[PDB]
Write a protein that binds this ligand. Structure first.
Ligand SMILES: CN(CC(=O)O)NC(=O)C[C@H](N)C[C@@H](O)CNCCCN
Ligand SMILES: [Mg+2]
Ligand SMILES: [Mg+2]
Ligand SMILES: [Mg+2]
Ligand SMILES: [Mg+2]
Ligand SMILES: [Mg+2]
Ligand SMILES: [Mg+2]
Ligand SMILES: [Mg+2]
Ligand SMILES: [Mg+2]
Ligand SMILES: [Mg+2]
Ligand SMILES: [Mg+2]
Ligand SMILES: [Mg+2]
Ligand SMILES: [Mg+2]
Ligand SMILES: [Mg+2]
Ligand SMILES: [Mg+2]
Ligand SMILES: [Mg+2]
Ligand SMILES: [Mg+2]
Ligand SMILES: [Mg+2]
Ligand SMILES: [Mg+2]
Ligand SMILES: [Mg+2]
Ligand SMILES: [Mg+2]
Ligand SMILES: [Mg+2]
Ligand SMILES: [Mg+2]
Ligand SMILES: [Mg+2]
Ligand SMILES: [Mg+2]
Ligand SMILES: [Mg+2]
Ligand SMILES: [Mg+2]
Ligand SMILES: [Mg+2]
Ligand SMILES: [Mg+2]
Ligand SMILES: [Mg+2]
Ligand SMILES: [Mg+2]
Ligand SMILES: [Mg+2]
Ligand SMILES: [Mg+2]
Lengths: 82, 101, 127, 206, 99, 151
RNA sequence: CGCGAAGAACCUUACCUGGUCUUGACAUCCACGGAAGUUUUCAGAGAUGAGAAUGUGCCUUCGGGAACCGUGAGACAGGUGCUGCAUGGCUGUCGUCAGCUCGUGUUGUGAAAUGUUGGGUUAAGUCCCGCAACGAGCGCAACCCUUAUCCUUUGUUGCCAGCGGUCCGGCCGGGAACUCAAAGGAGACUGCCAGUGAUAAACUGGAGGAAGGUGGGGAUGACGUCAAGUCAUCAUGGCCCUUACGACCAGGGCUACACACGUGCUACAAUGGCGCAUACAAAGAGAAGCGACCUCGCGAGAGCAAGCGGACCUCAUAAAGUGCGUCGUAGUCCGGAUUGGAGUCUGCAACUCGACUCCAUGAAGUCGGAAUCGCUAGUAAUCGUGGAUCAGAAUGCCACGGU
């Protein structure tokens, strides 16, 4: 829980979103920035988020705002023991 | 300890005093509340990230000065725990004798 | 005139002044019932003046420092005997058999490396 | 079992420190490291000058190095050229101006460092290690020592299995704290690996 | 006004001949001296593992003692001030003057 | 022990009465070094013996101690692979030590509210030769004259 | 098996995926061109990519010299790659167990023996007698550190007995008595005495003494054993890789989770829980730090901000304890795991994966099968405090005192 004086976002994601919003969407937007906050400006976009080997496409719903981008890309492969 | 690991420590320390301990103003008093509470602080939180990923005093590992060991460090001597014993028995650390209480 | 004694216990130190004639016990500018809440501590300061009968016959001015409740009370009892032996010089062999002249030299043992306490060893398992 | 270092247990009892300076916590690690640099340089340069001990002492903000040596005429040189081709580089490593002084070890055969360096040079020259060992024990007892022990370790004569062989003469009471025991260590680098040498020399009590 | 001089060293024999030389020397030119005062001895302690690899319970414990002596001079005559500056004592003794 | 054989260590008397058997009783009750809390239970329980069931305060504790004292005990004595239970005469300092432990351990497994009341009823039950501290004493004496033949 | 690791979000980091480099991230030498350094710019996740503004110092053989940069090529650099069964150094362990050897002599064809065995005694191969052994060395003990008593010196930032004053605060003059600080000295040696023992050693007991039989605790680990541990702290022989097993970067992982084991913490309550009031410590740390007073916040904390490189200032309010009240044996006013919401701080960054605060939630657990561990006195048990590592992050570790 970061303090209330400023939410965090990268610069390269912040600028790549704002250009991509004023053109209609696209490809899924490749980023490595798992730590950046999803903003209100990004509802509707598709962001391909790195998880270690792949980029998981996340379509931003309204209720994903306020969370971090890395919450919607699982970094660990696991399915049972036996 | 793998020569290039010794060079990482000496680059990090040169790039931190290049920028920081002077270019701390962006977080020193730009991120505290007065008339600078407008978009100027928001320009600081973004401008503080385009300085290189190094340059911060919290990425220095503080290795031993002779062997480069990352663990067992003692800030008082600058050596690892191996080198302080190897050098204390020869009488070269001043005043450092075996304690018995 | 005052007759002075120094007594010490675990980490406590007591200074003791005695003046002829009263049953006044004052310790750190407090009386005994206000200073020592424990009646065992109340009864170990009265031990050397109950063996030697100077109960309403000798005043006592006491200061203490350091240690805790029972440590400070034992340092006083040792310090009263040293003061009463400067006063008379012949209450000595009366007090040696009461064990009040021996300075109790039992101190806390230091914690040792590899051990959880001074002597308690961590739990061993065969495998 | 493992033994205590006989020099460290006697520091402040009969053995002095090799550094005699004071510092707060600010400049302790810099004075300690720069003394490592000045010691490493003086050992490499006075290699065949038979150097026993390097005593470093810092006044207010100068440093002065006292070198105990067996061959002082070579350390000073011809005209006094190599004491200040030594002091313009020591003062550049310590950061403060330097004043080199030069001492004497009168009998190098009763110094554990010099006796240990004699075996290491001979072991790397392919000399039988026993004669190197027994000559060091013999030369020390004829010069008045009350004891000596030498010890070599590791792949002796190029053998595949390493062994440690030691030879004692006189009296070396390492458990006695009053004993003036001079102990030092050296390493020989041969074509089959490293051979370590240890020398204890006992000179009397108190 | 009393000039106050604190001496710090790792050795107590070296520190006493540093006190003895400044106790010698203010009285050389006629000053009030109180003499030397022992300040409390600071012991720093250190506890290292002595194996290169495991064995947590095998250790060595080292310490550094720092000995303190205090002498104040409240006759600072002007024969004293530079005559106190011309004095050569040992390299193991830290002197710090302060008014 | 084999070699270092011991003298004794000294106990202080009690403050209110001046008895060390009473002070040994507070030591046996004490848990985790809390000596002041053990005297509070021991003092409050003994006067609540006095006017509930019969006077002479400290005379009543010694007489309750007279019944729980054993005289014989069993002890195992090994021969070559066979251990007999041999009945032993218990010594007078061991008599009080076993009696006070059985009183304290009787009072802990009761159903009263406080510990000072559990102590008071077990000391009262010992005066009437009833309870569980007396029956702990009875089982020791029953086993001893059961193995009388292995003397 | 809370072990290397005295402290993995990035870093550390050695692992993975992807993006990149090939005399190199680190060192020497040669040649040429540029003194450097600074601010800025757009691309890229970043390493890097394409430039602008600027400087053109100090030495001057001022044909040039040293610091620093770029480019080329070569010898080379580089490896936390393998072998601890090729090694050094260092360490564990039996074990702080009382042992382990040698010289000369003598006995035996000889491997070997004697000494070192025997009678006593001791913690001790400790000491005394005896004896084909006479002596010596490494161990034992002592010398060293700390603690317990006293004496001398000095007396602040530490102290307050006698005095004067007081705001009744050691507070102010003052005192050097006392506590205390740290240098020096004394003291314990079976020294004295009874008894027992072989005219022995030595043992039991007594006196004096603060302390009595190595007074308490520490450091000190003999010859060797386990081809014990460590090529990964370092060093190093051999082997192997070299436009890669080397170097740079972003994100991830070392924190996974049917399960099994070790070491711990917190509990299952009344010798207690909660509420109010109030006592008595030692020892440590502090300058890109410790941070008072005051103000704001329920709180973690925020603002302002003096003092302190410290017997002075700060961390820093010791807790168990004591007095009063309540709960009245309940899955409880016991327990505080788990989860939801709102926050604070460190830091480019708190999603994976930090600590702490507030409100709510209120699991298991009612003393634990077979088995098994520690401790002989200021010990066990119980209760708080500090430190290293460290931006932040201990129930671990290393220390300190109370009962
Ligand atoms: C935690 N407390 C709970 C309590 O207080 O009872 N103690 C215990 O669990 C141990 C139990 N008391 C005794 C046990 O060690 C010996 N019995 C052996 C059984 C068969 N080997
Ligand atoms: Mg290397
Ligand atoms: Mg860090
Ligand atoms: Mg304790
Ligand atoms: Mg452990
Ligand atoms: Mg050791
Ligand atoms: Mg990385
Ligand atoms: Mg990582
Ligand atoms: Mg790759
Ligand atoms: Mg390597
Ligand atoms: Mg091995
Ligand atoms: Mg090894
Ligand atoms: Mg292995
Ligand atoms: Mg053995
Ligand atoms: Mg022989
Ligand atoms: Mg023969
Ligand atoms: Mg033998
Ligand atoms: Mg034999
Ligand atoms: Mg004896
Ligand atoms: Mg024997
Ligand atoms: Mg014999
Ligand atoms: Mg012997
Ligand atoms: Mg010894
Ligand atoms: Mg003394
Ligand atoms: Mg006696
Ligand atoms: Mg690689
Ligand atoms: Mg791990
Ligand atoms: Mg209550
Ligand atoms: Mg219940
Ligand atoms: Mg249930
Ligand atoms: Mg509750
Ligand atoms: Mg509940
Ligand atoms: Mg920290």
């Amino acid at each position: 829980r970061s303090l209330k004086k400023g939410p965090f976002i990268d610069l390269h994601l912040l600028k790549k979103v704002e250009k991509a919003v004023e053109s209609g969407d696209k490809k899924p937007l490749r980023t490595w920035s798992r730590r950046s906050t999803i903003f209100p400006n990004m509802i509707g976009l598709t962001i391909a988020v790195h998880n270690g080997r792949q980029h998981v496409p996340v379509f931003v719903t309204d209720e994903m705002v306020g969370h971090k981008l890395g919450e919607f890309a699982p970094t660990r492969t696991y399915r049972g023991h036996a | 300890a793998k020569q290039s690991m010794k060079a990482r420590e000496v680059k990090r320390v040169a790039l931190a005093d290049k920028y920081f301990a002077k270019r701390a103003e962006l977080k020193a008093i730009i991120s505290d509340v007065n008339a600078a509470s407008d978009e100027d602080r928001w320009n600081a939180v973004l401008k503080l990230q385009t300085l290189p990923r190094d340059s911060s005093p919290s990425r220095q590992r503080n290795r031993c000065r002779q062997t480069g060991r990352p663990h067992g460090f003692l800030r008082k001597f600058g050596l690892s725990r191996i080198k302080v014993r190897e050098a204390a028995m020869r009488g070269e650390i001043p005043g450092l004798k075996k304690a018995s209480w | 005139n005052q007759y002075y004694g120094t007594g010490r216990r675990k980490s406590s130190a007591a200074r003791v002044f005695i003046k002829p004639g009263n049953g006044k016990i004052v310790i750190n500018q407090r009386s005994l019932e206000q200073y020592f809440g424990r009646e065992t501590a109340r009864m170990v300061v009265r031990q050397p003046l109950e063996l030697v009968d100077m109960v309403e016959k000798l005043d006592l001015y006491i200061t203490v420092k350091g240690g805790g409740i029972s440590g400070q009370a034992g340092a006083i009892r040792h310090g009263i005997t040293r003061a009463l032996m400067e006063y008379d010089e012949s209450l000595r062999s009366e007090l040696r058999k009461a064990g009040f002249v021996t300075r109790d030299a039992r101190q806390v043992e230091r914690k040792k490396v590899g051990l959880r306490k001074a002597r308690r060893r961590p739990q061993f398992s065969k495998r | 079992g493992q033994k205590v270092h006989p020099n460290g247990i006697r520091l402040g009892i009969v053995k002095p420190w090799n550094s005699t300076w004071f510092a707060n916590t600010k400049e302790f690690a810099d004075n300690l490291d720069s003394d490592f640099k000045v010691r490493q340089y003086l050992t490499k340069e006075l290699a065949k000058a038979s150097v026993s001990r390097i005593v470093i002492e810092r006044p207010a903000k100068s440093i002065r190095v006292t070198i105990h040596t067996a061959r002082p005429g070579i350390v000073i040189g011809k005209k006094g050229e190599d004491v200040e081709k030594l002091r313009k580089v020591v003062a550049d490593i310590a950061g403060v101006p330097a004043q080199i002084n030069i001492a004497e070890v009168r009998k190098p055969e009763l110094d554990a460092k010099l006796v240990a360096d004699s075996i290491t040079s001979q072991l790397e020259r392919r000399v039988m290690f026993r004669r190197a060992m027994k000559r060091a024990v013999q030369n020390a007892m004829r010069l008045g020592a009350k004891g000596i022990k030498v010890e070599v370790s590791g792949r002796l004569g190029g053998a595949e299995i390493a062994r440690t062989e030691w030879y004692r003469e006189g009296r070396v009471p390492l458990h006695t704290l009053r004993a003036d025991i001079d102990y030092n260590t050296s390493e020989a680098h041969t074509t089959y690996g490293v051979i370590g040498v240890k020398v204890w020399i006992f000179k009397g009590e108190i | 006004q009393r000039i106050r001089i604190r001496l710090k060293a790792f050795d107590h024999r070296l520190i006493d001949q540093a006190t003895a030389e400044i106790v010698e020397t203010a009285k050389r030119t006629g000053a009030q001296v109180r003499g030397p005062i022992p300040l409390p001895t600071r012991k720093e302690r250190f506890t290292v593992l002595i194996s290169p690899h495991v064995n947590k319970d095998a250790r060595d414990q080292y310490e550094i003692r720092t000995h303190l002596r205090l002498v104040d001079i409240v006759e600072p005559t002007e024969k004293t001030v530079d005559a106190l500056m011309r004095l050569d004592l040992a390299a193991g003794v830290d002197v710090q003057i302060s008014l | 022990p084999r070699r270092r054989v011991i003298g004794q260590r000294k106990i202080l008397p009690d403050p209110k009465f001046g008895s060390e058997l009473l002070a040994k009783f507070v030591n046996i009750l004490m848990v985790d070094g809390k000596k002041s809390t053990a005297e509070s239970i021991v003092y409050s329980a003994l006067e609540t013996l006095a006017q509930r069931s019969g006077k002479s305060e400290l005379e009543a504790f010694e007489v309750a101690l007279e019944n729980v004292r054993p005289t014989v005990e069993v002890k195992s004595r090994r021969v070559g692979g066979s251990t007999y239970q041999v009945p032993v005469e218990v010594r007078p300092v061991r008599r009080n030590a076993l009696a006070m432990r059985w009183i304290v351990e009787a009072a802990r497994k009761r159903g009263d509210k406080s510990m000072a009341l559990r102590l008071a009823n077990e000391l009262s039950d010992a005066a009437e030769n009833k309870g569980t501290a007396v029956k702990k004493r009875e089982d020791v004496h029953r086993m001893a004259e059961a193995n009388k033949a292995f003397a």
